[PDB]
Design a protein around this ligand. Sequence first.
Ligand SMILES: O=C(N[C@@H](CO)[C@@H](O)c1ccc([N+](=O)[O-])cc1)C(Cl)Cl
Ligand SMILES: O=C(N[C@@H](CO)[C@@H](O)c1ccc([N+](=O)[O-])cc1)C(Cl)Cl
Lengths: 205, 206
Amino acid sequence: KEEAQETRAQIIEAAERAFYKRGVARTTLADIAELAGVTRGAIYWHFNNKAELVQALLDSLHETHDHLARASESEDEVDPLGCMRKLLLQVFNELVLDARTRRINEILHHKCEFTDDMCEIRQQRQSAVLDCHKGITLALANAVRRGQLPGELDAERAAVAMFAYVDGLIRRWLLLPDSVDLLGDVEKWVDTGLDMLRLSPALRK
Amino acid sequence: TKEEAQETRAQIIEAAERAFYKRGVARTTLADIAELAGVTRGAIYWHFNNKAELVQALLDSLHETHDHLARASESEDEVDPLGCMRKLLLQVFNELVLDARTRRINEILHHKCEFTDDMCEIRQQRQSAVLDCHKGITLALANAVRRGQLPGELDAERAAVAMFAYVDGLIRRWLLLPDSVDLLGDVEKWVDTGLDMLRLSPALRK
Ligand SMILES: O=C(N[C@@H](CO)[C@@H](O)c1ccc([N+](=O)[O-])cc1)C(Cl)Cl
Ligand SMILES: O=C(N[C@@H](CO)[C@@H](O)c1ccc([N+](=O)[O-])cc1)C(Cl)Cl
């Protein structure tokens, strides 16, 4: 029950609407609280500040891909590349179909400044990205151990090349959706990225 | 013409950069730049109507340093369009790593500028600019295909979107975590990796 565990989910939903409408920079807890139907104190009970909320939205994105990620990263996975290809297809699908994922991504890329007032936001991002980076490198190592991608493949650099590509593609669809048939052509887009990892000599040390 | 005005504009723009960088585009009024640049408010209004007008000016300063190579790389009469495109991206990354002004505007563009219904002109311009850039990379690519620099069957369109995506994300990665990408030392590698995808990826063909 009680007071309400699910109040925490109600506050997050309102934080999404507020951030999407006014942007993170100019949203205050008061705004969010009025929007949720609660008091600032009810927000303070779940979050110590605005950075914590942003954090929660960020963190929510990882859930849906949890299993597919852990799969690719694991040593005992027979088909590590196959899991990464699967995950990317999910990432792009969730992005195109789920208004929730779209909005949080929109907030993250286009509605969330990095300013000296909440270095917390930029810090959250940095570590979030280094994390994702570590994960990516691990997967690349596994695909190599299994000869799914060329032997002496500079993992670190390919990881960055991957993340960059995917990241910029997401941001591109966000800015101009009707100029990237992301849904229909998911296969191509994902593979374009994947092809780079194996066919590109520049990524080979 | 009056040199007095041309100097005041150059000062508004310099201060906008320093402002937007520290406080961000969202919570920064034009009045704030007036005090920062040491100029009358109405003067900024003479120079720039709304804040979006200024942001636009910052975005613009970026294309100056590359206009030459960009044009060359698009020209149908250009003998080595892929070489041009290569040299251009090299000249983009160098200026990023070396020129603090360029780094700051990109940081503003990527990390300090929100899209809100209040200021929709910022998003519209941002869309306009990327469509501009887009049309650019397509011509260039097509010209490199036409000259057997790339695979004949390449899809210029998608290929352009891919490359831009790759270039845009890398810049951002470096702004967020500079001490990760040795963009200065490995510069040629990063430029090549992107290009390799354009010519080697079978998913980009047809
Ligand atoms: O799913 C995510 N990122 C995708 C799409 O950008 C991708 O970059 C990614 C691929 C593998 C990975 N690894 O399994 O942890 C993490 C992220 C985020 Cl939830 Cl980190
Ligand atoms: O970084 C920039 N442009 C990138 C976009 O990917 C660069 O790759 C580019 C610029 C112009 C261009 N066109 O004019 O030929 C093509 C690519 C500008 Cl914002 Cl300075």
